[PDB]
Amino acid sequence: KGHVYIEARKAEAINDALKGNVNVFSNNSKFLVGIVEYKDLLRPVKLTRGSYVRVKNGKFKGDLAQVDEVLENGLEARLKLVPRLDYGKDLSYTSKFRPAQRLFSEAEARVHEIRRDRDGFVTYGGEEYYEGFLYKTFRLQNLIVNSINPTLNELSLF
DNA sequence: GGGTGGTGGCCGTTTTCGTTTTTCTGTCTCGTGCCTGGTGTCTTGGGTGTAATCC
């Protein structure tokens, strides 16, 4: 970030390539690059099913999960979460007023608030609930699969 | 119903160039004293002076 490279053959060529630009610090702060480093400036640079992942988007941010099914297009990956639902207690959400999490129990939703499709698979307000676990189409940008440090609650649960 | 979009949330973040008194501290060209290698001055004695005559 903040570093811009221009491939020229003379210093004044770089000067005029960066001249006439207001998005450039007025200083001519330019440094040469070693032969080995030339290719190092253009180097471009772990998502598996059953991989423990966390969410960062919308209301369910910061919730660990399991990647369930990846779409053929390669942009959206299904997740297995522990729902955070209110059972119609205050329906008449964000990432700061959210109550705690708990696996879907069909009995509670039936008693308080529901189209049963298969055994354990419940479609509730556009949400997929398999065996009490939250299923929804999560965009790959919304999820973290690398560098996840499991917490105490995850050891207790996972 | 579903496409387009203001939106509230979330998320993380910088850059046009536009005064006063002292003591202590660290450089500073500048100077001086030194020094050593080419050189300085002495003085003896024999050659280079000199002088006549031969032949």
Side-chain angles (χ1 to χ4, degrees):
Chain A
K1 177 61 73 72
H3 272 253
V4 172
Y5 312 91
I6 306 160
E7 179 176 29
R9 292 219 175 258
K10 292 174 285 178
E12 65 186 3
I14 301 291
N15 283 328
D16 285 324
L18 64 94
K19 186 176 184 179
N21 213 305
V22 71
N23 271 322
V24 184
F25 270 69
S26 180
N27 54 9
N28 60 5
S29 66
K30 53 184 181 294
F31 53 96
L32 289 170
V33 183
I35 278 177
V36 73
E37 313 164 277
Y38 273 90
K39 62 92 174 180
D40 294 335
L41 302 177
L42 292 149
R43 285 213 64 249
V45 290
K46 297 171 181 177
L47 188 86
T48 54
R49 308 294 79 75
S51 64
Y52 280 134
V53 295
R54 214 183 268 278
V55 178
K56 303 132 53 172
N57 177 51
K59 286 79 68 175
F60 292 166
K61 67 165 294 301
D63 292 331
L64 206 69
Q66 168 174 174
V67 188
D68 291 331
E69 200 257 334
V70 67
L71 274 183
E72 189 277 331
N73 306 347
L75 184 55
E76 282 170 342
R78 280 278 284 278
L79 292 189
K80 173 183 196 177
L81 281 73
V82 176
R84 176 273 321 165
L85 314 177
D86 292 274
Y87 292 103
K89 204 152 193 174
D90 48 9
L91 296 197
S92 71
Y93 272 120
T94 176
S95 169
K96 186 262 183 179
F97 308 143
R98 62 196 187 170
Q101 77 164 21
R102 175 176 174 164
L103 309 174
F104 213 68
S105 303
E106 290 79 1
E108 274 172 334
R110 183 181 64 250
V111 168
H112 285 302
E113 200 266 324
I114 296 167
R115 287 189 180 183
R116 303 178 179 173
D117 197 38
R118 297 286 152 91
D119 188 71
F121 178 34
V122 172
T123 287
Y124 175 72
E127 292 267 19
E128 295 203 356
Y129 295 158
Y130 183 69
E131 291 168 341
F133 312 97
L134 156 60
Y135 281 51
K136 191 180 186 60
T137 49
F138 274 87
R139 308 171 183 272
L140 181 56
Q141 57 165 106
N142 295 340
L143 315 178
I144 188 167
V145 64
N146 302 344
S147 67
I148 311 170
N149 288 119
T151 50
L152 295 156
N153 49 2
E154 277 143 351
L155 269 72
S156 80
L157 297 166
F158 296 109

